[PDB]
Design a protein around this ligand. Structure first.
Ligand SMILES: Cc1ccc(S(=O)(=O)Nc2ccc(Oc3ccc(C(=O)O)cc3)cc2C(=O)O)cc1
Ligand SMILES: [Mg+2]
Length: 559
């Protein structure tokens, strides 16, 4: 069927939309070619609609059914709990989109009577009505990028706040534990960056002759069929569930997940969706299961040998035993035709890779550097263009979510995160006296509130002390960074080193945690290297829930 149907009403913004990076003294200090940075707006929605609107072709075979059963066998071992209204409310980010029924995220978090009572009526409605398509809002997403040698806006679709809290009640526990139970080590979100690198590196070295490839599905959400979503529900249904949770899942599947009506911000009927909605709780888990199911079966169809996969939502990376250059290229092509029949045609043409550093997955790649001892150390990195562009935008404009903070956290060991992001934001924060103010950022889609001053302990725990001593990065990595800086008009190494020494001096003079940030985060900026010993606070850190599951588009806040 058609992924989308349109009435002709426009996808409208609900306020003024900024498209250009402001000329700001602070941001200009980070990136000078401000004209290369732009934010997508509803003005390009029409372009996106065209690309995501098409008929889906799907042919299921024995391999598909075989794998599905294997997956359900594992799902069968799970017992999901069903969250209380209060537990669900507490999972709503403070900046979550308000309800059209007289209450916002704040009322939900504070368990206001109007919010809880409306939430209860919505739940009761899910138990009683198994057919009525739930309404959803379609909006053009506002994201920042750097121009290329421009991307149209992504379209997000999400139900009312009341429904969102109900989703949490019925499926939060499911989407948090089912993926790992069914997919085991193949489930990417259970890994921290370091553990992802470890898994990838060990898998790679475990092959006699490794061959790997990332597989990019063209607009994955739109390729998801009604069949796919019901297959997804069938897996969820193998879980031991509370009666009400079971009905809620059945109802949400038919009324929301398989599709439904689209309404713009002006309240006008916009069209109909028959594919994955980007803004529901099951999107990450659902996409991961779907991608995993299709790929695993595609692998069997292509006769790839000793396949080891890593799936993060619609992101897939496979590492196998090579059968030789020619055979590999043919097998990859067969794999692709298999995925195509399953309704997951390729966007960028997949290509086999024989150098692990050249494989980009989850927008990142593995690279190696050296610690102070001179020992090789693997770590996760990525082209810094987008991170830097967004860092600039966030410097000039206040944003609910600070991607720079998440990038410092997730890419702490990288040359660019340390040289530029750390230096830039700490100098600004120290100057504005806000080192103590907690800020929100996202990790695998979930929102977290973090204190910049705790960064040293966080980095030590997630990446190890070596994150503060890496040097001698790869020529490929160094060149990518340097070319990025020239492209965006970002100051050179020497400028950042000078700025870094300057902030480090100040951080040290403040004592306490600031001093710790100065010693560990910027030891790279000085010749007189301080001794970096284990930070006591890094022992009493509970960072386990950070890497349990993916929640992008799931409106999740972890506290
Ligand atoms: C966190 C960090 C760690 C070590 C150093 S270093 O000064 O000890 N060595 C390097 C300094 C710059 C660099 O990569 C660049 C970056 C920018 C430019 C440039 O501005 O053109 C040139 C080389 C790579 C390395 C290395 O150890 O491999 C600087 C920053
Ligand atoms: Mg894709």
């Amino acid at each position: 069927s058609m992924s989308y149907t349109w009435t002709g009403a426009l996808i409208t913004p609900c306020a003024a939309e900024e498209s250009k990076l402001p000329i700001n003294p602070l941001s200009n200090s980070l990136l000078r070619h401000h004209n290369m940075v732009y934010a997508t707006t509803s003005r390009s929605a029409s372009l996106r609609q065209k690309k995501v609107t098409f008929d889906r072709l799907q042919v299921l075979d024995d391999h598909y059914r075989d794998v599905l059963k294997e997956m359900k066998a594992k799902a069968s071992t799970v017992k999901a709990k069903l969250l209380s209204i209060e537990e669900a409310c507490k999972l709503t980010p403070p900046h979550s989109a308000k309800s059209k029924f007289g209450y916002g995220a704040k009322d939900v978090r504070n368990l206001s009577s109007r919010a809880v009572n409306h939430i209860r009526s919505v739940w009761e409605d899910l138990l009683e009505d198994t057919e009525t398509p739930i309404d959803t809002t379609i909006m053009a997403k506002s994201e920042v990028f750097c121009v290329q040698p421009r991307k149209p806006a992504r379209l997000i679709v999400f139900p009312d706040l009341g429904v969102r809290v109900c989703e949490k009640m019925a499926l939060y526990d499911v989407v948090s534990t089912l993926p790992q139970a069914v997919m085991g080590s193949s489930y990417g979100f259970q890994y921290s960056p370091k553990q992802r690198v470890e898994f990838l590196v060990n898998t790679w070295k475990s092959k006699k002759c490794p061959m790997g490839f990332s597989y990019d599905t063209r607009c994955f959400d739109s390729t998801v069929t009604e069949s796919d979503i019901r297959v997804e529900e069938s897996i969820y249904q193998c879980c031991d569930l509370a009666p009400e949770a079971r009905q809620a899942i059945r109802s949400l599947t038919e009324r929301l997940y398989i599709g439904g009506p689209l309404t713009n911000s002006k309240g006008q009927n916009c069209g109909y969706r028959r594919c994955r909605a980007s803004g529901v709780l099951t999107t990450s888990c659902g996409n991961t299961l779907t991608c995993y199911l299709k790929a695993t079966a595609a692998c069997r169809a292509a006769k790839l040998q000793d396949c080891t996969m890593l799936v993060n939502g619609d992101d897939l990376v496979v590492i196998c035993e090579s059968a030789g250059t020619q055979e590999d290229a043919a097998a990859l092509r067969a794999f692709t035709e298999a995925m195509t029949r399953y309704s997951a045609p390729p966007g960028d043409p997949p290509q086999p890779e024989y150098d692990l550093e050249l494989i980009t997955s989850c927008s990142s790649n593995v690279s190696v550097a050296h610690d102070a001892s001179g020992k090789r150390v693997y770590y996760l990195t990525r082209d810094p263009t987008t991170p830097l562009a967004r860092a600039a935008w966030e410097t000039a404009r206040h944003t609910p979510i600070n991607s720079w903070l998440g990038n410092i956290i997730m890419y702490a060991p990288t040359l660019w995160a340390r040289m530029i992001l750390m230096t830039h934001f700490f100098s600004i924060l120290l100057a504005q006296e806000q080192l103590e103010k907690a800020l929100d950022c996202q990790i695998y889609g979930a929102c977290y509130s973090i204190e910049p001053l705790d960064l040293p302990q966080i980095i030590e725990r997630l990446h190890g002390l070596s994150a503060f001593t890496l040097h001698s990065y790869s020529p490929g990595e160094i060149n990518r960074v340097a070319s990025c800086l020239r492209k965006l008009g970002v100051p050179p190494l020497r400028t950042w080193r000078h700025r870094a020494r300057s902030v480090r001096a100040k951080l040290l003079s403040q004592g306490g945690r600031a001093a710790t940030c100065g010693r560990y985060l910027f030891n790279w900026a000085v010749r007189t290297k301080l001794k970096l010993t284990p930070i006591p606070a890094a022992s009493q850190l509970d960072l386990s829930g950070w890497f349990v599951a993916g929640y992008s588009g799931g409106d999740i806040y972890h506290s």
